[model samples]
Structure formats: C-alpha cells, structure tokens
Target: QKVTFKEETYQLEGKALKVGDKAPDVKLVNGDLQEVNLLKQGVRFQVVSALPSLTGSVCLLQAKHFNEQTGKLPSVSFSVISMDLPFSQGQICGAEGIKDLRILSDFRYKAFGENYGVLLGKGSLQGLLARSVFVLDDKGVVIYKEIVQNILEEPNYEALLKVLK
Candidate 1:
C-alpha cells in the first residue's frame, strides 16, 4: 500500500488488512520492554493505533485523549504503537502521567508496522509508520480502520467510537 505524509507519497510494506480481516498476532514491546501478544490481551474490543512517534505533539495528544477515554470504555483495551524506543515510550508516559493506555514500541522489531501495512517504505519518514488506527472485535476481526491520508492528522475517533457502540 502507498500512503501520503505531509503531501508526499510513500510506499508501505505488507498487505493492508481490511474491516473483516483477522488481526495479526504480532509481538510488541511494552514500556517495560516485555513482549506483548496483541491477540492474547483477552479483551472483547481493542483499539490499536500506529503513530510516527510519541515525541510529536499530535501523537502525544492523541495518546492522552485515548488514555482519558480508557476509563469510560472499560470493555475496550487501548494500545498505541510507535517507532519510538521502549525507553522513550516509558519516559513520555511517566512525564505525561498516562497510566491507562498501553504504549508499545515497534522500534526494535518492525513487526507491528510491517504487518499492519503502515510501514513507510520511502520518503523522508521512510521506516516510520503512517498514522492509522484499527478497531477489533472479540473475534479479532477488524470492525473499523482509518489510515489517515496525512500522517500529521489524527484518526477519526468519533467514527471509531460509533463502531464500538
């Protein structure tokens, strides 16, 4: 798949998973640097977001917003994945006082990015992930997905919440 970031096109690796597609069971590193199996989270609803990095202002706000909603959406599990190192992820969470959302790192292994078709294959942001979000049901089937045309823009959270409801 090819996506645009900042008005420039970039090739993305991996097959794009659709609304009814089964979510990939990829291993990701959490803030503690421990491996986490996405499929094993044991949650009926899951919100998986892929961002360029946690260091960006938009990404930080996106994460914090989702974190705030986590308490209200008790049945749903929220995760934000980025190319940032696990250490950086931890630092940001600590500094921002984000305790609800699970911050995962795709820095060491690009499994999540590549498997999700958000891995940028070319351009200045090559190797980073295109901003996107996936909402999965209990069966691990994608119920909603948003691949933002502009990487700088945030995903459609309202549409995502509607689908969840």
Candidate 2:
C-alpha cells in the first residue's frame, strides 16, 4: 500500500487490511515491558490507533486527543501503539498525564506493523507504523478500518468512533 507524508508518497509493507478481516494477534508491549496480545483487550470492543512515534507533535496530539474522547466509550478499550521505547513511552504518558488510552509499543519485534500493513517501507520514518485506526469486535473481527493515506494528517475519528458509540 502507498501513503503520503508531507505530499511525498511512500510505500507501506504488508497486505492491505480491511474491515471484516480478523484482527491479527500481533505481540506488543507496555510501559513495564510486559508482552501483550494486541487483539486481546476489551472483550466487547476495541479501538486501536497506530502511530509512528509519540514524540512527534502530530502523534502526541492525536493520542492525547483520543484520551479525552475515548472515555465516552463506556464499554470500549482505546489503545495507541507506537515504536517508542517502553521507557520513553512511560515517560511521555506520565509527563503528559495520558492515562486514558492504553499505550503500547511495537519496538520489540515490530510485528504489529508488518501484520497490520502500516509499516513504512523506506526513506524518512522507515520501519515506523503509519497513522491509522481500527475497531474490532469481541470476535477479533475488524468492524471499522482507517489507514490514513497521509502521515502528516489525522485519521477520520468522526467516522472511526461512530461505530463505537
């Protein structure tokens, strides 16, 4: 798949995933270095936001924004996965008071990026996951998907969250 960053198009690795596809059980991590099954949280509903790095303004702002809004989802689990180290991820969350969203890191094996088709293929920000959003049901089946075509822009949260509420 192809995505744009600041108007320059770039390639994304892996096959394009879509709604109705079973969410991949990719391994990820938390601030404490605990192994996590990406699709295991929230028995009823899950909202996943994938970003390149939380240190960037766009990524952090999006995460923080989701933190406040996702709370309205009573029975949903909102998560953000990034390439940031567990230590840095922890620090960022703590410093920014970002406690609403479940923060995860793909820095270990980066399988989440490959399996989700959001991995940047080359050039700047290579190997980082693209900015995207996904909503999964209890059966681990994707119900909504948004792989943002431009890394510099934000995902369609209005459309992405409409299903949850």
Candidate 3:
C-alpha cells in the first residue's frame, strides 16, 4: 500500500505485527560475501533489524544498540539490514566499532522492502526500508515484531526482550 510521508499518520503501524505469524524468508550476505538465507541460520530466534541508512545518526545508533544488545544474548542472531551496499555497511560498522552484529544489504534485492512491508512510500527516504524489527523463531515463525510508528523514533526494546524471554 502506498502511503504519504507523515511523522504520525504515514508511520508504519496498525497491521504492524503480532505474536504468531510466519516470518518471511529472505537472502542476505554475510561479511564473507556469502548469501545466507534467514531461515537457514537454524538459530532459535533472529532479529531482522531494518534501517534507512548508516550515514545518519539515528540509523547508526540503532545498529550500535543492536550490537551492544547481541552480546547480552548469544543464542539469537540479529541481522542489521539496509539498502546500502555491503561494502558501505562494512565501512560504517568498522568506523563505528560495530563488529559483533551481522549487517546485510538489500540494495541488490528490492524484494525485502516489499516482502517485509517496510517500504518507504513517499519521502526523501522513498524506497528505503522503514525503521522496524522482526523477531522470529528458528522455524521462521514471528514471535515478536514492531514497526516504529515514527521513522525517527526507536522500536520498543523492552517489549521485544519480554517476548524473547
């Protein structure tokens, strides 16, 4: 659905996410440039973290926060995704001291933005992934999910943690 850009109304919510839905399978590249299927990781849970760009402060913070949180939970793997190229993501992560989280690029595959329903409709960030989070179990079932209503706001970290627990 095409939506106009609004800090409130145009935000991603409503049909957002619940507790039980099959997580969509998508491909992402590892640091080694190998394609990894989200479902093939075989982990108990996965956090698919979406960002617009790594050049911005908010997106940078989101990635940094995810990296910090990953250390606390070694069982689950969170994939940091953006439309930027993998090389660009690597540069930003290295400069920001983010070595613990897996960063994936969706520039090569536009399917992710549409498949995940986080596509930015009309804005300067048009065609970019909206700030969102999808928590999934090993079987590719979504147990927790949240789409930041306001593009500039952060997702509910506590609520996500509660579901994981």
Candidate 4:
C-alpha cells in the first residue's frame, strides 16, 4: 500500500488489513511501559488509530477529536497508536489533557506498523506508521477502516463514527 506525505508519495509496509478481517493480535506499550494487546481488551467495540507521531498539530488534533467521542460513546475502546516512545506518548497525552482515549506506543516491539499495514515504507516518513482508523467488533473483526490518503491530514472521522452508531 502507499500514501502521500505532503505532495510526495510513500509506500506502506506489510499487507493492508481490510474490513471483515480480524485485527491481528499485536503488542503495544501502554503509559506504564507494560505490554498489552488490543485484542485482549474487553472493549464492546475496539477503535484503533495509527498515526505518525503526536508531536505534530494535525496528529494532536486527531487524538483530541476522538478523545471527545470516546466520552460520547463509552462502550468503545479507543487507543491512539503511534511510533512515539512511551515517554513522549504519556507526556503529550498529559500535557494535552487527553483522558477519554488511551494513548499507546508501538516503538517497543515495532509490531503495529507492519501488522496493521500502515507503516510508511518510504520517504521522510519512513519507519513511521501511516494515518489510519479502524473500528473492530467485539470479536476483533474489523468493521470499518480508513487509511488516510494524505498523511498530512486527518482521516474521515465522521464516516467511521457513523459505523459505531
């Protein structure tokens, strides 16, 4: 798969996971630096967001946008996955007052980018996961997915939110 960063394009690593597919069991680091799999969460509906980094304004906005929705839809498990280290993930989440949605890091084992097929395989964004959104059912089957075409922008939040409703 491929995505655009600014005006240039980049290839995404791994096979693209699609709707109707079972989201893979991948390890991500929590704020406490503990390993936890998203499939293990007893989430009524699982929402996984893969982004490049939280250090950018666009990424920050994406996190906050869903963080608000998490409160509105309490049954959904929202995890904003990034390649940032645990320290940066926690620091930014705390600084931004992000509480409703969970912030997680895939830097430890480096599994999310490949398992989810959102890893940008070329350009300056290489090694970073692409911007994507996925909504999985209780059984972990993907129900909705959006791999944002432009990595510089946010995904279509409305489309995915409608799936949850």
Clashes of each: 0, 0, 0, 0
Q: Whole-model Cα lDDT per candidate?
A: 0.85, 0.84, 0.76, 0.86
The list of candidate 1 runs beyond 4 A from truth reads none
Off by over 4 Å in 2: none
What TM-score, over all chains together, does every model reach? 0.93, 0.92, 0.85, 0.94
- Looking at candidate 3, the ten consecutive residues that score lowest on lDDT are 8-17
Least lDDT summed over 10 consecutive residues: which range in candidate 1? 1-10
**Which candidate ranks first by lDDT, i.e. highest?**
4
Give the poorly placed runs of model 4, Cα more than 4 Å off. Answer: none
- Tens digits of lDDT, candidate 2, 51-120: 9898988898889977886677668878899989989888998999998778999988888888888888
- The local lDDT score (0 to 100) that residue 146 gets in candidate 1 is 91
lDDT of 1 by residue, 5-70 (tens): 666898877778888999998988887779988664677889888888889998998899888978
Which has the better lDDT: candidate 2, or candidate 3? Answer: 2
lDDT of 4 by residue, 9-109 (tens): 98878767899998899888888889988664677788889889999999999999988988888788888999999898888989999976788888887
The per-residue C-alpha lDDT of model 2 at residue 46 equals 85
Largest TM-score belongs to which candidate?
A: 4
lDDT of 3 by residue, 6-72 (tens): 5434434223345587766777776667887755476778888898898878899999989997898
- Model 2: weakest 10-residue lDDT segment is 38-47
> What are the C-alpha RMSDs, in order, of all predicted structures?
1.4, 1.5, 3.1, 1.3
